[PDB]
């Protein structure tokens, strides 16, 4: 049952690889995840990871429930690094039952635990849930139970157990590392239809990490290694690039699935992700004050390109990792200056969620301002951008935005241009958009044609009598 396309990187690690740097007992020697080539291979040479890491059918693919934390089943799967993005997308949709998302919400930041102001908590974890409740979106978190990826899990917990509504299920996809997950043992069973349980132990872990409790689905990537951290990055960007290219069809109008990044406190690796996201043309949002790299960007966001005041402004990394601001490194500071300049240079692709000036509007509204600004700034050959924005607004089911942003602007439009959107709204039963289009002037006596009726009657409610 589809245990043959999803493979996992496994190979003996102590063929010949010592160092020794992490002596402990050995480099994951016999009676460990290393089990296949325990007899004598040819030489071993230098490990040099083209010493063939076997891709055999996966042994960790099932349904996981947390023993004494929650009681709802959760799906997971062990995935190799070289797995094509299309295979994972097919697995997530066709066999996990997930509907095609209307929006991707990438949540990045720092793994280290932290706290913010209670007002910021109460606004962020109340807006992030509502961004998804209305839209039917996906939340690609960081996986495990520490930091930004733990706070989003807390946000989902603050909803799915207080206002436990089946209508509008929260879909959070956890992408983490196999080899970093702590208790992956007792979770390996090559016939995986089992509802095994996870002992959520945060105390036992050393240089490892446990999975977060509140996550609808889990995706684990590995190279057959132990303790490595930078392995899930080049399968998250690759997956997101493909999901963004994938398209939705629905009733009458077809859209291109958008994507957004939501940052928080982050280290050197969050800044690089922010840079790589904006280069590909994906808008990102920064909150007004919680964290090392986020707050630097928030403060330098309206200034023109005149920088390297960063030597002073980087004090917000209060712990001063590598022991102070002048002694991070001259090379790393001069590298971060270029990155900050690059981020600030794309005005359209970047927005900052200034607390006092934008939270009263909402966080929801700014998190949809990012996508609309990106679509407006995209090159479109004339008029295509407005209709694409309307198509997105139909799927958002956000009539307030669809009005206040793409009908309060004075672009040229004829009432006939709304007919393909009018049909989609009628099929999807959104009377609020019907009212908006009638206010803007869609004359039904002219809109309702013979072919329009014929098409409408082929899209009745299948559950109707």
């Amino acid at each position: 049952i589809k245990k043959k396309e999803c493979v996992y990187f496994v190979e003996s690690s102590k063929l010949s690889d010592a160092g020794k740097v992490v002596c402990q007992c050995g480099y994951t020697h016999e009676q460990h995840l290393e089990e296949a080539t325990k007899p004598h291979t040819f030489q071993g040479t230098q490990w040099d990871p083209k010493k063939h890491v076997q891709e055999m059918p996966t042994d960790a693919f099932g349904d996981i429930v947390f023993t004494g934390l929650s009681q709802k089943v959760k799906k997971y799967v062990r995935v190799s690094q070289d797995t094509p993005s299309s295979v994972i997308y097919h697995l997530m949709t066709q066999h996990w039952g997930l509907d095609v998302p209307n929006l991707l919400i990438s949540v990045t930041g720092g793994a280290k635990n932290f706290n913010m102001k209670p007002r910021l908590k109460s606004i962020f974890r109340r807006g992030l849930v509502k961004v998804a409740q209305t839209t039917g979106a996906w939340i690609i978190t960081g996986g495990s139970h520490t930091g930004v990826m733990k706070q989003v899990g807390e946000a989902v917990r603050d909803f799915s157990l207080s206002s436990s509504y089946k209508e509008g299920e929260l879909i959070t996809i956890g992408v983490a590392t196999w080899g970093t997950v702590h208790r992956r043992e007792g979770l390996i069973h090559p016939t995986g239809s089992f509802p095994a349980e996870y002992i959520l132990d945060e105390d036992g872990q050393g240089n490892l990490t446990c999975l977060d409790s509140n996550h609808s689905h889990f995706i684990l990537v590995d190279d057959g290694t132990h303790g490595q951290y930078g392995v899930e990055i080049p399968l998250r960007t690759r997956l997101e690039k493909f999901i963004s290219e994938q398209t939705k069809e629905r009733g009458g109008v077809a859209i291109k699935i958008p994507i957004v990044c939501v940052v928080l406190e982050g280290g050197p690796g969050t800044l690089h992700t922010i840079d790589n996201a904006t280069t590909n043309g994906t808008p990102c949002v920064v909150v007004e004050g919680s964290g090392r790299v986020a707050d630097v960007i928030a403060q330098v966001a309206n200034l023109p390109v005149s920088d390297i005041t960063i030597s002073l402004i980087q004090q917000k990394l209060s712990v001063f990792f590598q022991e102070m601001f002048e002694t991070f490194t001259e090379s790393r500071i001069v590298e971060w200056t270029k990155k900050i300049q690059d981020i600030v240079r794309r005005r359209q692709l970047l927005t900052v969620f200034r607390e006092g000036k934008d939270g009263q509007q909402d966080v929801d509204v700014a998190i949809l301002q990012a996508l609309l600004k990106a679509s407006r700034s995209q090159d479109h050959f004339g008029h295509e951008n407005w209709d694409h924005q309307l198509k997105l607004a139909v799927a958002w089911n956000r009539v307030d935005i669809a009005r206040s942003e793409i009908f309060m602007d004075e672009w040229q439009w004829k009432p006939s241009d709304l007919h393909p959107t009018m049909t989609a709204a009628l099929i999807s039963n959104k009377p609020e958009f019907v009212k908006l289009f009638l206010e803007n002037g869609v004359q039904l006596k002219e809109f309702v044609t013979w072919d329009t009726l014929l098409y409408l009657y082929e899209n009745l409610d299948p559950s109707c009598l």
Binding site: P304, V305, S306, R345, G356, Q360
Partner: peptide, 19 residues
């Protein structure tokens, strides 16, 4: 009235490059 008091509870929290 209930929808307008909600509109008021939220209203009171407002306190070179050429290279």
């Amino acid at each position: 009235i209930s929808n307008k008091v909600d509109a008021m509870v939220d209203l009171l929290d407002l306190d070179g490059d050429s290279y």
